[PDB]
Paper text:
I-PpoI is a well-characterized intron-encoded homing endonuclease member of the physarum polycephalum slimemold. Surrounded by two beta sheets and an alpha helix, the His-Me nucleases active sites all contain a single metal ion, a histidine, and an asparagine.
Because His98 has been proposed to primarily activate the nucleophilic water, we first mutated His98 to alanine. As expected, cleavage activity of H98A I-PpoI drastically dropped. Furthermore, we found that titrating imidazole in H98A and H78A/H98A I-PpoI partially rescued cleavage activity, similar as observed in Cas9 and EndA nuclease. (D) Structure of H98A I-PpoI active site after 100 mM imidazole for 15 hr following 1 mM Mn2+ soaking for 1800s. Moreover, the metal ion was not observed in crystallo when His98 was removed. Without a proper proton acceptor, the metal ion may be prone for dissociation without the reaction proceeding, and thus stable Mg2+ binding was not observed in crystallo without His98.
Numbering used by the authors:
A (entry chain B): 202 to 363
B (entry chain A): 2 to 163
DNA sequence: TTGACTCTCTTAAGAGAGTCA
DNA sequence: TTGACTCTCTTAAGAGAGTCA
C-alpha cells in the first residue's frame, strides 16, 4: 500500500509464505563446461498455493493483501521490488527469473529489469561461459547454443552483396 | 499447386524488384571491438513500395503474384525460402533478419529458423565476439551488453538460500 | 492482375482486473 | 477477509487474409 511501513509488511509477509514453499534442488549448466546448484522455492502445482496467492494463468500467479479495508494485488514475482522504480529508460520493469523456473519464487533468483533484458537472459552463455550482465546470470540460458537454422542467407542471381 | 519452376520464377521476380530498392551502407559492431559494413536493400517508407509489394502493418509487408488466375501471397521476407522446409523440431520457420533492419529485404541478410533462434540473435556477441550460431551472425546483436538492471536478487529476512 | 489500404493472429518472456463462495 | 477460479492485455521478434477499384 502507500506507506513504506505497509510495503515492508507486504514484502516480509510474502517472504514468510514463500519461505515455506517446497525447496527443490536443480543442477544447472553454468557455461564453460561447469555445473552448479540452485535451490528454488516452488509454488504448488494446484490449490491451495499459500496464504495470499492465487493462480490467474497456467504459470501466472498473484499475491493479494487487504490494507485499509482495500484489496491490493500484485504479480506474484514482483513483490520483492515494491520499493523500486517501476520503469527504466521509459520501459516497464519486470520480474526476471534468473533460474528460468517460473514456479520458483525465491527472491535470490529474481531481478528487476526491462522485458528486453529479461528475455535476453534465455540466450546468455552463463556466469562461467562469458556472461556480461551487470547483474550476473545464475546459469547458462536454456536456449544458448548453435541453433537449428534450416537455411542460411542465399540468392539465386547476382543483384546483392553483403 | 505452384510447380518448382513457378516457385523459382516467383523468387527471381522478388530478387529483381528488391535489387532495385535503395542500397544503404551501415557501419555495425561485429563484436570484439571491431567494426564492419553491411549493405541493406531497404523497402520505401510509404507507397509505392515496388512491383508486388504492399504494407500490411507498420513494419510488415507482403509479396503478391497472380498465377493462372490465382492470387498467391507471402510474407515479404519469406520469399527466398520458398523451396525450404517450413518447420523444424516441431517449430515454424521464420525469416530472421541478420542485419536487425526490418525494412531491409537483402536475401544475403536473412536466414530461416525458429522464432526462438531468430529472437536470440538480438543478444549475440557477434561474429568477432564469440558467436556460436551454426549459421553465423553478421553483426553483434543490438541488445548485447551489460543490460540496465534496476535491482538484483535480495531478501529482507533469512528465509532463503541461493 | 495489381496497388493500397483494412483487420486479426503467433510466441514466450511478462502483466491487470472481475466473479463467485 | 481469504480462497479459487474466470477473462483479457503488453512487447517485439514474427505471420494470414479481406475489400475495392
Ligand atoms: Na525471464
Ligand atoms: Na530477428
Ligand atoms: Zn529458482
Ligand atoms: Zn548473463
Ligand atoms: Zn540488411
Ligand atoms: Zn550469433
Amino acid at each position: 500500500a502507500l506507506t513504506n511501513a505497509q510495503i515492508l509488511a507486504v514484502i516480509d509477509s510474502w517472504e514468510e509464505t514463500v519461505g515455506q514453499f517446497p525447496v527443490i534442488t536443480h543442477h544447472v549448466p553454468l557455461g564453460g563446461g561447469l555445473q552448479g546448484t540452485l535451490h528454488c522455492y516452488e509454488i504448488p502445482l494446484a490449490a491451495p498455493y499459500g496464504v495470499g496467492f492465487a493462480k490467474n494463468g497456467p504459470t501466472r500467479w498473484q499475491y493479494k493483501r487487504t490494507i485499509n479495508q482495500v484489496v491490493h494485488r500484485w504479480g506474484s514475482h514482483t513483490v520483492p521490488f515494491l520499493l523500486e522504480p517501476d520503469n527504466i529508460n521509459g520501459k516497464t520493469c519486470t520480474a526476471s527469473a534468473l533460474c528460468h523456473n517460473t514456479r520458483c519464487h525465491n527472491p535470490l533468483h529474481l531481478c528487476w529489469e526491462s522485458l528486453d533484458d529479461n528475455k535476453g537472459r534465455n540466450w546468455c552463455p552463463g556466469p562461467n561461459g562469458g556472461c556480461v550482465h551487470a547483474v550476473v546470470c545464475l546459469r547458462q540460458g536454456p536456449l544458448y547454443g548453435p541453433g537449428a537454422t534450416v537455411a542460411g542467407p542465399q540468392q539465386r542471381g547476382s543483384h546483392f552483396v553483403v
